[PDB]
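User: These chains co-purify. Model them together.
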Amino acid sequence: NLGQLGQYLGAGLACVGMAGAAMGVGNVAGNYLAGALRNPSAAASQTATLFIGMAFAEALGIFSFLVALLLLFA
Amino acid sequence: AAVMAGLTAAAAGMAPRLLAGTGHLLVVMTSERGLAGGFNSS
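Assistant: Joint model of the two components:
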């Protein structure tokens, strides 16, 4: 009943937090595509940076999932 | 030449433009009339 209302609304608020994450990561991704156009020859650097840059953009989204799972399952 | 040397200083890379680097045509300028010694021979 009452307590679970708090928990449930917390899960929703956590899902709302992900609206930002997808936006930020999207920014990163789009720069890669634009860069390929200018210098296909520098794909070596681009590919390496893809991993590093993408990882950072992901991490905070993962931490939010953990928090959502905590609110949902104790 | 001044403006051209400025643009080439900041000309992105690779990929630039074909006219600044391709990745033989011989043009020869001579007179129409002679009587100019070895001008055309040289």
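Chain B touches chain A at residues 12-15 (CB under 8 Å).
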